[PDB]
Structure 1
């Protein structure tokens, strides 16, 4: 299977919106990650492309080129390959050590701060969208449901993303307006909890009960593994159900657990 200079190889991931295949560029003897889409709706794809084109940061995946033939049902987004893949699988019985979690969380902070400075809300932060690069550092992937805003913050009313990572203020049964940056912070807190415990803090196979726990169940830390108190403080602050008192990224950067 060829597509201009690219040979499609085996699958390497299903994010949101498509499937990703390893791809060999015969012109430069280099592997890439190719997202393949079947037109099934397409406005959102070209907004992801437009967002990706604006971004250039070591902790954000790099869109290389787009292959769109109007006579083809398939549309191809070529990314730079992130050779080591997602930072971890959730759930797992072998979570990261605190020191490993901090190393990756520092990259996540820098990438989110950059995205927000670029006026992008990611909306799907989770470990499987955090890819480990050649040098061991994280690259944030999958902008399939990201939002671009004008002004100081996004003012949003739509519910998108991965259910276990959705912030409780996005789960009102009344299309209320909520702000964007705090959504990414919440998902960062669920992500950090996942790093050290290997499962999400709020879990239910019944989607109604999952929504209800995100919105109303107090955060509980397992007895094991035994994590430091300042890490518990940081996670608690990011998983503040009230978005107005939830910790903000300029504070996360300063948090004692982050800086030691």
Structure 2
């Protein structure tokens, strides 16, 4: 267990895009943290993606958002460390899974997600990678939105984007055009919340293919189909359908989601 300042690094708990995430025990505090360990050699070969994320994380203080506690950036060392509050239960689920959440467990987490995304949208942040593996379950049973590695900070009431980033299964149709286009960033987040809620209760994504262009094609043009098992309520089917509206103009928005009967019952 390598020691770095006050911390003692224990097992790897996962990997992000670059580097590793390790459980870390703090000797000053007598408590555990999650430490993202990044190699600057490896980031200098392929980030400025690291320092924007850090600038975003420093602005963010909400019980449904992961908390960045400190950055250890030595100019004359290779490693850059990023220390987060540990969210001790890990992700809300693995996808695909044969054991999806119940409708009631899904609602609980979905309410937390609304609260978190609403905060993020209020702070003028589009997450751009909302999915179950980025939603970490804490001590209290609540979720914290994690991984701001591709998020975008905007000026104005919405972000107006053209670049395609994120996880393909949760990308909205308006973002998958062959020609360059411009699309609302908030509506992207909402579509991803809908694919997320679909996963919560069915344990798989609504559109899936290993082939990227077959996936894009289904996202853009395949109608939403619900399986026979599980049998989910019609109020839930309506909310998912409204979030996975392929037209970003008519797609439901976060203020409307909050007032939806599946949410408020």
Q: Same fold (TM over 0.5)?
A: yes
Correspondence for 1:177: 182
SS of equivalent to 2:96: coil
How far does residue 157 in structure 1 lie from its aligned partner after superposition? Answer: 0.9
Residue 56 in structure 1 maps to residue 72 in structure 2: no
CA distance in 2, matches of 1:32, 1:256: 38
CA distance in 1, matches of 2:144, 2:41: 28
Alignment coverage as a number of residue pairs: 260
How far does residue 89 in structure 1 lie from its aligned partner after superposition? Answer: 0.7
Unaligned runs of 5+ in 2: none
Q: 1:194 to 1:40 in 2, by over 3 A?
A: farther
How far does residue 53 in structure 1 lie from its aligned partner after superposition? Answer: 0.3
Q: 1:227 to 1:40 in 2, by over 3 A?
A: farther
Residue 150 in structure 1 maps to residue 155 in structure 2: yes
CA distance in 2, matches of 1:63, 1:46: 13
Q: 1:116 to 1:67 in 2, by over 3 A?
A: same
Paired residues of 1:15 and 1:129 also in contact (CA < 8 A): no
How far does residue 19 in structure 1 lie from its aligned partner after superposition? Answer: 2.0
| Residues 189-198 or 6-15, more deviating | 6-15
Give the TM-score normalised by structure 1.
Answer: 0.98
Q: 1:27 to 1:258 in 2, by over 3 A?
A: same
Moved over 3 A (4+): 15-18
Deviations 1:139-163 (A, max 9, x none): 0000000000000100111111111
CA distance in 1, matches of 2:144, 2:17: 16
CA distance in 2, matches of 1:149, 1:32: 30
Q: 1:40 to 1:239 in 2, by over 3 A?
A: farther
How far does residue 40 in structure 1 lie from its aligned partner after superposition? Answer: 4.9
Give the TM-score normalised by structure 2.
Answer: 0.96
Q: 1:78 to 1:223 in 2, by over 3 A?
A: same
CA distance in 1, matches of 2:106, 2:263: 10
Cα RMSD between the aligned structures?
1.0
Unaligned runs of 5+ in 1: none
CA distance in 1, matches of 2:219, 2:70: 38
How far does residue 71 in structure 1 lie from its aligned partner after superposition? Answer: 1.4
Paired residues of 1:16 and 1:142 also in contact (CA < 8 A): no
Deviations 1:111-163 (A, max 9, x none): 00000000000000000100001100000000000000000100111111111
SS of equivalent to 1:10: strand
Paired residues of 2:41 and 2:78 also in contact (CA < 8 A): no
